[PDB]
């Protein structure tokens, strides 16, 4: 790997520089190198890993959606035939997106998840596993789509079980996990009622725990609660 010769601490330092420069492909490559050093990641390092790949895949997903929409219009009745280019280029972006998801899932499987023993790290990584299988599911159309969806479901479900047992209802990782699992239900698993129920119960249980929090923790939790509320407003 191209980062094999760089110190772990230098990789982390450069990931932070790349973040400041909004160079998220570089940031992801640096954090991949840091993971491949084989030591567990701290809370901050896990967040650096997550931010980098979220931004990389977010750009690819946005581009895939633009191209998929163009492609769908090209296949309408009365559309002029333009040749294979739209499909080809959508497939190119899709393949690159899948490659990024496979890379992240490979880091989680070798060997982030199996070494993660604390609730905060184990839930964080399982949420990530659910997220990147969900991004694979967004573009899946073939005979493996059901298995991809079930892999996302299973990762989210294990993360939910641990988070409910080991974390308070206001924990921001627990909240963001529930938010993403609710989006999975709504737009991947064709279960909008499950999505709405999860979002509401998650919001209501966090509301009831806010009184235990410092001012700074209150700010962190209410920020994600507002996203749950916004989704509920959109969905009902």
């Amino acid at each position: 790997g191209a980062m094999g010769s760089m110190e772990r601490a230098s990789l982390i330092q450069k990931a932070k520089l790349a973040e400041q420069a909004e160079r998220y492909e570089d940031m992801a490559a640096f954090m991949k190198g840091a993971v491949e050093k084989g030591e567990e990641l701290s809370c901050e390092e896990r967040n650096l890993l997550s931010v980098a790949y979220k931004n990389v895949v977010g750009g690819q997903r946005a581009a895939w959606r633009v191209l998929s929409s163009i492609e769908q219009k090209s296949n309408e009745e009365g559309s002029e035939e333009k040749g294979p280019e739209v499909r080809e280029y959508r497939e190119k972006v899709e393949t690159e997106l899948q490659g990024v998801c496979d890379t992240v899932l490979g880091l989680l499987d070798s060997h982030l998840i199996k070494e993660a023993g604390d609730a905060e790290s184990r839930v964080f990584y399982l949420k990530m596993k659910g997220d990147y299988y969900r991004y694979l599911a967004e573009v899946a159309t073939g005979d493996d789509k059901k298995r991809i969806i079930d892999s996302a479901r299973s990762a989210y479900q294990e993360a939910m079980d641990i988070s409910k047992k080991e974390m308070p209802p206001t924990n921001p990782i627990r909240l963001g996990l529930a938010l993403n699992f609710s989006v999975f239900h709504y737009e991947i698993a064709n279960s909008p009622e499950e999505a709405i129920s999860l979002a509401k119960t998650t919001f209501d249980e966090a509301m009831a725990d806010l009184h235990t929090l410092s001012e700074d923790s209150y700010k962190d939790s209410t920020l994600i609660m507002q996203l749950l509320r916004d989704n509920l407003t959109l969905w009902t």
Partner: peptide, 10 residues
């Protein structure tokens, strides 16, 4: 508006 998914802590 497009639904929210979880933002990054950072």
């Amino acid at each position: 508006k497009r639904r929210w998914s979880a933002p990054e802590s950072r």
